[PDB]
Amino acid sequence: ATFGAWDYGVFATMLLVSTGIGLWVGLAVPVGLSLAASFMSAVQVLGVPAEAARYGLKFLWMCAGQLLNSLLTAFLFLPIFYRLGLTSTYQYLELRFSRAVRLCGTLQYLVATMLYTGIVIYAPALILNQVTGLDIWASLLSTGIICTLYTTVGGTDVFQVVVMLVGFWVILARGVILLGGPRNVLSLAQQHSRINLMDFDPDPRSRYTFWTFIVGGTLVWLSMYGVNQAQVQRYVACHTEGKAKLALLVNQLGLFLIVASAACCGIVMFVYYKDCDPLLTGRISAPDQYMPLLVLDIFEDLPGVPGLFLACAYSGTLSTASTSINAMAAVTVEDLIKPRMPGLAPRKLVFISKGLSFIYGSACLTVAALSSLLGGGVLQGSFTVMGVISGPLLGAFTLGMLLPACNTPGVLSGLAAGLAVSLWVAVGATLYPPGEQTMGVLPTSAAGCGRPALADTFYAISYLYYGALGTLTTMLCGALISYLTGPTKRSSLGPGLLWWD
Ligand SMILES: [I-]
Ligand code: NA
Ligand code: NA
């Protein structure tokens, strides 16, 4: 399970070329594909195939969970932000409830993005460690060095999406060629119940079901695209509000393609490891090393393909991390400092921007190391952190956008309660992980070569519900206390803020 001779050279050369091009640069369909490219880091490459291989093909419902998300963002959140010409999405909060809510929302965005970028830095480290033969910590150090060179020197997404999706297609083609024909692969996956699209298991403990996707995944993708900062800023830069919607729908098509290719590569990966499954044989340690192992195993006759594909999947996600870190620094120095501080020359402010970029780089690397220590689940971990933090923020946004009677006390108390409950599940589900069989992990073979009351019912809910469980309560708490301290008469909101218009 190591690169080899022709693969190390290709990996090194491609990484050097990627860094050189990125720095040399530093010193409406394109945007649609850039939006998806953002969240197509190594996290998805390592998670979606593994989840599809383990839990079956129900993971395709994720696409639906994104589709229903985009529609909402297309027809419920895009008009409000776009028609108001908001410089920052969280400026809405300031115009709606108060500047304190703007501050809290910006802080939640910063923390959530920091954790998510830490996990996005962890995943490439996982790739490098699993494929080269370096301990997780030396690989994490190398990943941090490269990410900081990208960020603290100088900040194409269409190219990344195209190249990595073509890599997915090539992996799938080679795999299905090896296993015979596509009909044989489909029948083999069908024998072991890997083709189970129709899974309406009502219970919420099941990790992946129709309800779980349509609700939790929809709300999480909403709090990752609908009310995010970078995505909304990309929207508002377009024209006439039609180009924005077309960019959003093209982004949705790109996401559909990426996640469907990944969910099919997962099934190919399983059918490949039908017997002598690497996981319960000691060949790999966690169910996130599946994809690099598949890449190495299938292309054990092509001297170069592993290096090219993994170098791309590494450099593109490091670029994503640098972009997220720089956006974090920019929003901090635009929405929190400059409004607060009277006014400072263009030198001190760029120096503060560099300082915040560096600080966020270090904090994200530290979060990556913490994720490495705790365990795995780059996909699960990223969704967990993002949902857990940004869910109540999305609840605040939705309460402001669709409920007239809502004031600052309501939103703030709702955020407090939502973060409380969301972290309750986020931790109580980490101290007492749910059983592998309650999560519905499909069977496998390897012969071819509840202590507390709530750990069994409430901490076991699907990891896609956490954010939802936050958002909903934020709406229900904020709706309640707001109506207690006093309703907010609708004749106080001026321009279009409520969507009831
Ligand atoms: I995904
Ligand atoms: Na990602
Ligand atoms: Na994700």
Curated annotation (Swiss-Prot):
Membrane-related topology note: Multi-pass membrane protein
Pfam (any one): SSF
Residue ranges, Extracellular side: 53-56, 130-135, 175-209, 268-301, 375-377
Binding-site residues for Na(+) 1, renumbered to this chain: S41, V43, Q44, Y116
Phosphoprotein is among the record's keywords: yes
Recorded catalytic activity of this chain's protein: iodide(out) + 2 Na(+)(out) = iodide(in) + 2 Na(+)(in); chlorate(out) + 2 Na(+)(out) = chlorate(in) + 2 Na(+)(in); thiocyanate(out) + 2 Na(+)(out) = thiocyanate(in) + 2 Na(+)(in); nitrate(out) + 2 Na(+)(out) = nitrate(in) + 2 Na(+)(in)
GO molecular function terms attached to this record: iodide transmembrane transporter activity; monoatomic anion:sodium symporter activity; protein homodimerization activity; sodium:iodide symporter activity; symporter activity
Binding site for Na(+) 2: Q44, Y116, M224, S382, F383
InterPro entries for the chain: Na/Glc_symporter_sf (IPR038377), Na/solute_symporter (IPR001734), Na/solute_symporter_CS (IPR018212), SLC5A5 (IPR035689), Sodium:Solute_Symporter_SSF (IPR051163)
In-chain residues carrying the UniProt-annotated modification Phosphoserine: S491
Mutagenesis or variant effect for F383 to H/Y: Impairs sodium and iodide transport activity
UniProt activity-regulation remark: Perchlorate inhibits iodide transport activity. Oxyanions inhibit iodide transport activity by blocking the binding sites for iodide and one of the sodium ions.
Keyword annotations: Cell membrane, Cytoplasm, Glycoprotein, Ion transport, Membrane, Metal-binding, Phosphoprotein, Sodium, Sodium transport, Symport, Transmembrane, Transmembrane helix, Transport
Localisation: Cell membrane; Cytoplasm
Family stated for the protein in its record: Belongs to the sodium:solute symporter (SSF) (TC 2.A.21) family.
Function: Sodium:iodide symporter that mediates the transport of iodide into the thyroid gland. Can also mediate the transport of chlorate, thiocynate, nitrate and selenocynate.
Name of the protein in question: Sodium/iodide cotransporter
Originating organism: Rattus norvegicus (Rat)
